Amino acid sequence: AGFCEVCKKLVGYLDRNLEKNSTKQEILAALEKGCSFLPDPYQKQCDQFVAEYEPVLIEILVEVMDPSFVCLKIGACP
Amino acid sequence: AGFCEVCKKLVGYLDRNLEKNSTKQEILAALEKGCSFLPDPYQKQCDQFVAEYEPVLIEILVEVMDPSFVCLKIGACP
């Protein structure tokens, strides 16, 4: 549950601002900008989470963007 | 280097606001209040760091409070 809430949060914003057919290159850009959009308290945690999981984030978010489920599959929410 | 900067930061504030002879019980209180004193971006990362390392934090900070060194010994700064 360590990175779970920030995961749900970061993937939440992606889902909410990205169309379900984006290319790898648009999910990358979004991910690398996504943390500055979360409330202040989460920023530094988020872009640490992003640095650790963004290969798998990209690999999965081309398929599905449900935040609740994406964080589960990647292991962030146990 | 994942929790390294926030470590140095959290231990930095302890060092700066706590006397070198505090009891376990005063370092606990301080630690469990210490994250809300770091800039906004670090809060959520900090109290995740604190939840993960506070047994060893307490165990060491009764000896030494040099932030640079404390984070090294506990493994946060590799």
PDB file of N, CA and C in Angstrom, chain A:
ATOM      1  N   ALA A   1       0.826  -1.248   0.000  1.00  0.00           N
ATOM      2  CA  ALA A   1       0.000   0.000   0.000  1.00  0.00           C
ATOM      3  C   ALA A   1       0.853   1.289   0.000  1.00  0.00           C
ATOM      4  N   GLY A   2       2.178   1.107  -0.071  1.00  0.00           N
ATOM      5  CA  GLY A   2       3.176   2.191   0.010  1.00  0.00           C
ATOM      6  C   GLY A   2       3.091   3.256  -1.072  1.00  0.00           C
ATOM      7  N   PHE A   3       3.051   2.828  -2.329  1.00  0.00           N
ATOM      8  CA  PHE A   3       2.821   3.733  -3.444  1.00  0.00           C
ATOM      9  C   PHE A   3       1.401   3.619  -3.996  1.00  0.00           C
ATOM     10  N   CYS A   4       0.525   2.912  -3.285  1.00  0.00           N
ATOM     11  CA  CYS A   4      -0.823   2.651  -3.790  1.00  0.00           C
ATOM     12  C   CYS A   4      -1.682   3.886  -4.014  1.00  0.00           C
ATOM     13  N   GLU A   5      -1.771   4.786  -3.042  1.00  0.00           N
ATOM     14  CA  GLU A   5      -2.651   5.938  -3.236  1.00  0.00           C
ATOM     15  C   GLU A   5      -2.171   6.879  -4.327  1.00  0.00           C
ATOM     16  N   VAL A   6      -0.862   7.067  -4.429  1.00  0.00           N
ATOM     17  CA  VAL A   6      -0.303   7.933  -5.459  1.00  0.00           C
ATOM     18  C   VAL A   6      -0.391   7.288  -6.830  1.00  0.00           C
ATOM     19  N   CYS A   7      -0.353   5.966  -6.858  1.00  0.00           N
ATOM     20  CA  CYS A   7      -0.564   5.254  -8.102  1.00  0.00           C
ATOM     21  C   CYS A   7      -1.962   5.538  -8.598  1.00  0.00           C
ATOM     22  N   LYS A   8      -2.951   5.134  -7.810  1.00  0.00           N
ATOM     23  CA  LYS A   8      -4.334   5.357  -8.167  1.00  0.00           C
ATOM     24  C   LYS A   8      -4.506   6.810  -8.610  1.00  0.00           C
ATOM     25  N   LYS A   9      -3.827   7.730  -7.933  1.00  0.00           N
ATOM     26  CA  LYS A   9      -3.958   9.149  -8.225  1.00  0.00           C
ATOM     27  C   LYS A   9      -3.353   9.545  -9.562  1.00  0.00           C
ATOM     28  N   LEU A  10      -2.130   9.093  -9.815  1.00  0.00           N
ATOM     29  CA  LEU A  10      -1.448   9.414 -11.058  1.00  0.00           C
ATOM     30  C   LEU A  10      -2.108   8.753 -12.252  1.00  0.00           C
ATOM     31  N   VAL A  11      -2.478   7.489 -12.107  1.00  0.00           N
ATOM     32  CA  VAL A  11      -3.158   6.779 -13.179  1.00  0.00           C
ATOM     33  C   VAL A  11      -4.567   7.351 -13.347  1.00  0.00           C
ATOM     34  N   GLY A  12      -5.138   7.838 -12.255  1.00  0.00           N
ATOM     35  CA  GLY A  12      -6.434   8.490 -12.293  1.00  0.00           C
ATOM     36  C   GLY A  12      -6.461   9.675 -13.228  1.00  0.00           C
ATOM     37  N   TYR A  13      -5.462  10.534 -13.122  1.00  0.00           N
ATOM     38  CA  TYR A  13      -5.357  11.725 -13.961  1.00  0.00           C
ATOM     39  C   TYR A  13      -5.086  11.386 -15.431  1.00  0.00           C
ATOM     40  N   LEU A  14      -4.290  10.355 -15.674  1.00  0.00           N
ATOM     41  CA  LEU A  14      -4.019   9.909 -17.029  1.00  0.00           C
ATOM     42  C   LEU A  14      -5.324   9.516 -17.698  1.00  0.00           C
ATOM     43  N   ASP A  15      -5.978   8.504 -17.135  1.00  0.00           N
ATOM     44  CA  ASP A  15      -7.319   8.062 -17.514  1.00  0.00           C
ATOM     45  C   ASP A  15      -8.262   9.226 -17.843  1.00  0.00           C
ATOM     46  N   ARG A  16      -8.208  10.258 -17.009  1.00  0.00           N
ATOM     47  CA  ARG A  16      -9.127  11.379 -17.035  1.00  0.00           C
ATOM     48  C   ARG A  16      -8.766  12.402 -18.105  1.00  0.00           C
ATOM     49  N   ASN A  17      -7.515  12.391 -18.562  1.00  0.00           N
ATOM     50  CA  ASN A  17      -7.026  13.406 -19.497  1.00  0.00           C
ATOM     51  C   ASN A  17      -6.445  12.863 -20.795  1.00  0.00           C
ATOM     52  N   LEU A  18      -6.482  11.548 -20.958  1.00  0.00           N
ATOM     53  CA  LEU A  18      -5.871  10.899 -22.106  1.00  0.00           C
ATOM     54  C   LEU A  18      -6.924  10.031 -22.758  1.00  0.00           C
ATOM     55  N   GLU A  19      -6.926   9.976 -24.085  1.00  0.00           N
ATOM     56  CA  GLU A  19      -7.868   9.103 -24.791  1.00  0.00           C
ATOM     57  C   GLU A  19      -7.341   7.678 -24.856  1.00  0.00           C
ATOM     58  N   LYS A  20      -8.262   6.718 -24.787  1.00  0.00           N
ATOM     59  CA  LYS A  20      -7.940   5.289 -24.636  1.00  0.00           C
ATOM     60  C   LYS A  20      -7.135   4.671 -25.782  1.00  0.00           C
ATOM     61  N   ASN A  21      -6.660   5.500 -26.709  1.00  0.00           N
ATOM     62  CA  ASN A  21      -5.918   5.002 -27.871  1.00  0.00           C
ATOM     63  C   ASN A  21      -4.565   5.680 -28.088  1.00  0.00           C
ATOM     64  N   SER A  22      -4.109   6.406 -27.075  1.00  0.00           N
ATOM     65  CA  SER A  22      -2.844   7.109 -27.132  1.00  0.00           C
ATOM     66  C   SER A  22      -1.701   6.163 -27.463  1.00  0.00           C
ATOM     67  N   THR A  23      -0.673   6.691 -28.115  1.00  0.00           N
ATOM     68  CA  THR A  23       0.535   5.931 -28.381  1.00  0.00           C
ATOM     69  C   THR A  23       1.467   5.970 -27.176  1.00  0.00           C
ATOM     70  N   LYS A  24       2.323   4.959 -27.081  1.00  0.00           N
ATOM     71  CA  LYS A  24       3.407   4.913 -26.109  1.00  0.00           C
ATOM     72  C   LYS A  24       4.050   6.274 -25.854  1.00  0.00           C
ATOM     73  N   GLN A  25       4.263   7.019 -26.930  1.00  0.00           N
ATOM     74  CA  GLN A  25       4.941   8.306 -26.877  1.00  0.00           C
ATOM     75  C   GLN A  25       4.097   9.416 -26.225  1.00  0.00           C
ATOM     76  N   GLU A  26       2.773   9.272 -26.258  1.00  0.00           N
ATOM     77  CA  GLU A  26       1.872  10.243 -25.619  1.00  0.00           C
ATOM     78  C   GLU A  26       1.620   9.904 -24.153  1.00  0.00           C
ATOM     79  N   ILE A  27       1.692   8.619 -23.815  1.00  0.00           N
ATOM     80  CA  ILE A  27       1.613   8.176 -22.424  1.00  0.00           C
ATOM     81  C   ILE A  27       2.906   8.504 -21.681  1.00  0.00           C
ATOM     82  N   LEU A  28       4.044   8.397 -22.363  1.00  0.00           N
ATOM     83  CA  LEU A  28       5.335   8.818 -21.812  1.00  0.00           C
ATOM     84  C   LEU A  28       5.304  10.300 -21.424  1.00  0.00           C
ATOM     85  N   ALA A  29       5.063  11.161 -22.410  1.00  0.00           N
ATOM     86  CA  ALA A  29       4.933  12.596 -22.188  1.00  0.00           C
ATOM     87  C   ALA A  29       3.982  12.887 -21.039  1.00  0.00           C
ATOM     88  N   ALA A  30       2.797  12.290 -21.072  1.00  0.00           N
ATOM     89  CA  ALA A  30       1.824  12.503 -20.015  1.00  0.00           C
ATOM     90  C   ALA A  30       2.371  12.083 -18.648  1.00  0.00           C
ATOM     91  N   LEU A  31       2.907  10.869 -18.561  1.00  0.00           N
ATOM     92  CA  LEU A  31       3.508  10.360 -17.319  1.00  0.00           C
ATOM     93  C   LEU A  31       4.598  11.262 -16.766  1.00  0.00           C
ATOM     94  N   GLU A  32       5.428  11.795 -17.653  1.00  0.00           N
ATOM     95  CA  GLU A  32       6.548  12.618 -17.236  1.00  0.00           C
ATOM     96  C   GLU A  32       6.109  14.041 -16.936  1.00  0.00           C
ATOM     97  N   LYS A  33       4.818  14.306 -17.083  1.00  0.00           N
ATOM     98  CA  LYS A  33       4.251  15.593 -16.696  1.00  0.00           C
ATOM     99  C   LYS A  33       3.178  15.421 -15.635  1.00  0.00           C
ATOM    100  N   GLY A  34       2.705  14.189 -15.469  1.00  0.00           N
ATOM    101  CA  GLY A  34       1.580  13.861 -14.593  1.00  0.00           C
ATOM    102  C   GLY A  34       1.698  14.162 -13.114  1.00  0.00           C
ATOM    103  N   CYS A  35       2.913  14.139 -12.576  1.00  0.00           N
ATOM    104  CA  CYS A  35       3.118  14.332 -11.132  1.00  0.00           C
ATOM    105  C   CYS A  35       2.929  15.770 -10.674  1.00  0.00           C
ATOM    106  N   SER A  36       3.231  16.719 -11.543  1.00  0.00           N
ATOM    107  CA  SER A  36       3.079  18.119 -11.198  1.00  0.00           C
ATOM    108  C   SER A  36       1.612  18.532 -11.122  1.00  0.00           C
ATOM    109  N   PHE A  37       0.702  17.611 -11.446  1.00  0.00           N
ATOM    110  CA  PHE A  37      -0.740  17.891 -11.449  1.00  0.00           C
ATOM    111  C   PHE A  37      -1.439  17.340 -10.241  1.00  0.00           C
ATOM    112  N   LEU A  38      -0.717  16.541  -9.481  1.00  0.00           N
ATOM    113  CA  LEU A  38      -1.267  16.003  -8.266  1.00  0.00           C
ATOM    114  C   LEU A  38      -1.057  17.067  -7.216  1.00  0.00           C
ATOM    115  N   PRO A  39      -1.887  17.058  -6.170  1.00  0.00           N
ATOM    116  CA  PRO A  39      -1.710  17.998  -5.085  1.00  0.00           C
ATOM    117  C   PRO A  39      -0.259  18.057  -4.624  1.00  0.00           C
ATOM    118  N   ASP A  40       0.139  19.211  -4.095  1.00  0.00           N
ATOM    119  CA  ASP A  40       1.490  19.446  -3.590  1.00  0.00           C
ATOM    120  C   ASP A  40       2.112  18.297  -2.775  1.00  0.00           C
ATOM    121  N   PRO A  41       1.388  17.751  -1.757  1.00  0.00           N
ATOM    122  CA  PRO A  41       1.920  16.681  -0.891  1.00  0.00           C
ATOM    123  C   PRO A  41       2.451  15.440  -1.622  1.00  0.00           C
ATOM    124  N   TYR A  42       1.878  15.152  -2.788  1.00  0.00           N
ATOM    125  CA  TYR A  42       2.206  13.955  -3.546  1.00  0.00           C
ATOM    126  C   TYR A  42       3.309  14.118  -4.575  1.00  0.00           C
ATOM    127  N   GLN A  43       3.712  15.340  -4.901  1.00  0.00           N
ATOM    128  CA  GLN A  43       4.581  15.490  -6.061  1.00  0.00           C
ATOM    129  C   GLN A  43       5.801  14.594  -5.993  1.00  0.00           C
ATOM    130  N   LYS A  44       6.639  14.790  -4.980  1.00  0.00           N
ATOM    131  CA  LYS A  44       7.905  14.071  -4.859  1.00  0.00           C
ATOM    132  C   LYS A  44       7.772  12.547  -4.724  1.00  0.00           C
ATOM    133  N   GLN A  45       6.699  12.105  -4.091  1.00  0.00           N
ATOM    134  CA  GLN A  45       6.388  10.693  -4.035  1.00  0.00           C
ATOM    135  C   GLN A  45       6.019  10.165  -5.412  1.00  0.00           C
ATOM    136  N   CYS A  46       5.233  10.952  -6.147  1.00  0.00           N
ATOM    137  CA  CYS A  46       4.754  10.571  -7.468  1.00  0.00           C
ATOM    138  C   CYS A  46       5.884  10.370  -8.439  1.00  0.00           C
ATOM    139  N   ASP A  47       6.749  11.356  -8.598  1.00  0.00           N
ATOM    140  CA  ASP A  47       7.779  11.212  -9.611  1.00  0.00           C
ATOM    141  C   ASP A  47       8.886  10.246  -9.198  1.00  0.00           C
ATOM    142  N   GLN A  48       8.814   9.752  -7.966  1.00  0.00           N
ATOM    143  CA  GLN A  48       9.656   8.641  -7.549  1.00  0.00           C
ATOM    144  C   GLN A  48       8.968   7.362  -7.953  1.00  0.00           C
ATOM    145  N   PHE A  49       7.657   7.308  -7.754  1.00  0.00           N
ATOM    146  CA  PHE A  49       6.853   6.193  -8.219  1.00  0.00           C
ATOM    147  C   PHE A  49       6.969   6.022  -9.748  1.00  0.00           C
ATOM    148  N   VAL A  50       6.845   7.127 -10.478  1.00  0.00           N
ATOM    149  CA  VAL A  50       6.971   7.160 -11.935  1.00  0.00           C
ATOM    150  C   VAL A  50       8.341   6.675 -12.410  1.00  0.00           C
ATOM    151  N   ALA A  51       9.406   7.084 -11.732  1.00  0.00           N
ATOM    152  CA  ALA A  51      10.750   6.652 -12.103  1.00  0.00           C
ATOM    153  C   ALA A  51      10.943   5.157 -11.892  1.00  0.00           C
ATOM    154  N   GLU A  52      10.223   4.596 -10.927  1.00  0.00           N
ATOM    155  CA  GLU A  52      10.330   3.186 -10.618  1.00  0.00           C
ATOM    156  C   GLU A  52       9.435   2.308 -11.495  1.00  0.00           C
ATOM    157  N   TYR A  53       8.283   2.812 -11.907  1.00  0.00           N
ATOM    158  CA  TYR A  53       7.319   1.957 -12.604  1.00  0.00           C
ATOM    159  C   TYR A  53       6.963   2.316 -14.020  1.00  0.00           C
ATOM    160  N   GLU A  54       7.601   3.322 -14.601  1.00  0.00           N
ATOM    161  CA  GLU A  54       7.114   3.826 -15.889  1.00  0.00           C
ATOM    162  C   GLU A  54       7.273   2.945 -17.120  1.00  0.00           C
ATOM    163  N   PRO A  55       8.304   2.068 -17.163  1.00  0.00           N
ATOM    164  CA  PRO A  55       8.310   0.982 -18.147  1.00  0.00           C
ATOM    165  C   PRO A  55       7.055   0.119 -18.146  1.00  0.00           C
ATOM    166  N   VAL A  56       6.636  -0.370 -16.981  1.00  0.00           N
ATOM    167  CA  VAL A  56       5.417  -1.180 -16.892  1.00  0.00           C
ATOM    168  C   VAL A  56       4.171  -0.341 -16.976  1.00  0.00           C
ATOM    169  N   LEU A  57       4.216   0.869 -16.442  1.00  0.00           N
ATOM    170  CA  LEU A  57       3.110   1.780 -16.627  1.00  0.00           C
ATOM    171  C   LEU A  57       2.805   1.932 -18.115  1.00  0.00           C
ATOM    172  N   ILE A  58       3.794   2.318 -18.902  1.00  0.00           N
ATOM    173  CA  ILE A  58       3.600   2.461 -20.340  1.00  0.00           C
ATOM    174  C   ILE A  58       3.127   1.168 -21.005  1.00  0.00           C
ATOM    175  N   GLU A  59       3.783   0.067 -20.668  1.00  0.00           N
ATOM    176  CA  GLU A  59       3.455  -1.240 -21.195  1.00  0.00           C
ATOM    177  C   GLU A  59       1.972  -1.575 -20.956  1.00  0.00           C
ATOM    178  N   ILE A  60       1.415  -1.203 -19.802  1.00  0.00           N
ATOM    179  CA  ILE A  60       0.007  -1.521 -19.500  1.00  0.00           C
ATOM    180  C   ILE A  60      -1.020  -0.469 -19.940  1.00  0.00           C
ATOM    181  N   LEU A  61      -0.672   0.802 -19.826  1.00  0.00           N
ATOM    182  CA  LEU A  61      -1.633   1.866 -20.066  1.00  0.00           C
ATOM    183  C   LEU A  61      -2.001   2.003 -21.526  1.00  0.00           C
ATOM    184  N   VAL A  62      -1.280   1.309 -22.405  1.00  0.00           N
ATOM    185  CA  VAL A  62      -1.692   1.198 -23.816  1.00  0.00           C
ATOM    186  C   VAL A  62      -2.878   0.249 -23.972  1.00  0.00           C
ATOM    187  N   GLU A  63      -3.037  -0.663 -23.009  1.00  0.00           N
ATOM    188  CA  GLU A  63      -4.178  -1.579 -22.952  1.00  0.00           C
ATOM    189  C   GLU A  63      -5.354  -0.989 -22.173  1.00  0.00           C
ATOM    190  N   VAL A  64      -5.133  -0.698 -20.896  1.00  0.00           N
ATOM    191  CA  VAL A  64      -6.200  -0.277 -19.994  1.00  0.00           C
ATOM    192  C   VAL A  64      -5.754   0.887 -19.116  1.00  0.00           C
ATOM    193  N   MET A  65      -6.685   1.769 -18.780  1.00  0.00           N
ATOM    194  CA  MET A  65      -6.361   2.906 -17.940  1.00  0.00           C
ATOM    195  C   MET A  65      -7.163   2.963 -16.651  1.00  0.00           C
ATOM    196  N   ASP A  66      -7.949   1.935 -16.340  1.00  0.00           N
ATOM    197  CA  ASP A  66      -8.642   1.937 -15.053  1.00  0.00           C
ATOM    198  C   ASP A  66      -7.596   1.955 -13.955  1.00  0.00           C
ATOM    199  N   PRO A  67      -7.553   3.044 -13.174  1.00  0.00           N
ATOM    200  CA  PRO A  67      -6.505   3.267 -12.199  1.00  0.00           C
ATOM    201  C   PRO A  67      -6.509   2.215 -11.108  1.00  0.00           C
ATOM    202  N   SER A  68      -7.699   1.882 -10.651  1.00  0.00           N
ATOM    203  CA  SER A  68      -7.870   0.906  -9.614  1.00  0.00           C
ATOM    204  C   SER A  68      -7.223  -0.411 -10.035  1.00  0.00           C
ATOM    205  N   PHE A  69      -7.489  -0.839 -11.267  1.00  0.00           N
ATOM    206  CA  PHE A  69      -6.932  -2.082 -11.796  1.00  0.00           C
ATOM    207  C   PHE A  69      -5.468  -1.992 -12.240  1.00  0.00           C
ATOM    208  N   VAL A  70      -5.065  -0.879 -12.843  1.00  0.00           N
ATOM    209  CA  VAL A  70      -3.684  -0.737 -13.317  1.00  0.00           C
ATOM    210  C   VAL A  70      -2.690  -0.845 -12.153  1.00  0.00           C
ATOM    211  N   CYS A  71      -3.004  -0.186 -11.045  1.00  0.00           N
ATOM    212  CA  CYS A  71      -2.169  -0.236  -9.857  1.00  0.00           C
ATOM    213  C   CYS A  71      -2.106  -1.625  -9.233  1.00  0.00           C
ATOM    214  N   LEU A  72      -3.199  -2.360  -9.332  1.00  0.00           N
ATOM    215  CA  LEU A  72      -3.227  -3.739  -8.899  1.00  0.00           C
ATOM    216  C   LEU A  72      -2.274  -4.585  -9.733  1.00  0.00           C
ATOM    217  N   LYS A  73      -2.469  -4.625 -11.048  1.00  0.00           N
ATOM    218  CA  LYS A  73      -1.648  -5.448 -11.947  1.00  0.00           C
ATOM    219  C   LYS A  73      -0.150  -5.169 -11.872  1.00  0.00           C
ATOM    220  N   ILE A  74       0.228  -3.907 -11.659  1.00  0.00           N
ATOM    221  CA  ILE A  74       1.651  -3.517 -11.608  1.00  0.00           C
ATOM    222  C   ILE A  74       2.279  -3.775 -10.241  1.00  0.00           C
ATOM    223  N   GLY A  75       1.430  -3.998  -9.245  1.00  0.00           N
ATOM    224  CA  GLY A  75       1.852  -4.426  -7.920  1.00  0.00           C
ATOM    225  C   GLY A  75       1.847  -3.339  -6.863  1.00  0.00           C
ATOM    226  N   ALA A  76       1.410  -2.139  -7.238  1.00  0.00           N
ATOM    227  CA  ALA A  76       1.513  -0.997  -6.341  1.00  0.00           C
ATOM    228  C   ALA A  76       0.505  -1.093  -5.215  1.00  0.00           C
ATOM    229  N   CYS A  77      -0.673  -1.628  -5.536  1.00  0.00           N
ATOM    230  CA  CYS A  77      -1.764  -1.815  -4.580  1.00  0.00           C
ATOM    231  C   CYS A  77      -1.922  -3.295  -4.256  1.00  0.00           C
ATOM    232  N   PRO A  78      -1.369  -3.732  -3.115  1.00  0.00           N
ATOM    233  CA  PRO A  78      -1.443  -5.132  -2.758  1.00  0.00           C
ATOM    234  C   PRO A  78      -2.616  -5.383  -1.822  1.00  0.00           C
TER     235      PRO A  78
END
